[PDB]
């Protein structure tokens, strides 16, 4: 009976945390303004 040392199968943990409404999304160039942002504002040469 001492063969009980075993990591438990079927590995789910029951998610006690907040559910993920917003997952990390890569915001990059096309959804990145700049350019005209300093053209409408003239941050000087």
């Amino acid at each position: 009976p001492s063969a009980g040392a075993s990591i438990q199968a079927a590995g789910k943990e029951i998610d006690w945390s907040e559910k993920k409404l917003f997952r990390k999304a890569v915001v990059s160039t096309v959804f990145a303004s700049d350019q005209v942002a300093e053209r409408l504002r003239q941050d000087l040469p």
């Binding site: 915001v27 990059s28 990145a32 700049d34 942002a37 300093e38 504002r41 941050d43």
Partner: protein, 47 residues
């Protein structure tokens, strides 16, 4: 005498576990700095 055999499955030769792609592009960008309000009203300059 018996001979060996150079037999390969067509699924095993072409599907070896490939090296994992190198995870990259962890690019993070910063906003332009804010600017002050250097402006009047009509009832601050003319009065």
């Amino acid at each position: 005498p018996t001979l060996p055999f150079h037999g390969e499955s067509a699924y095993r030769t072409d599907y070896v576990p490939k090296p994992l792609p190198e995870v990259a592009k962890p690019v993070e960008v910063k906003l332009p700095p804010t600017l002050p309000f250097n402006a009047q009203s009509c009832y601050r300059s003319e009065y």
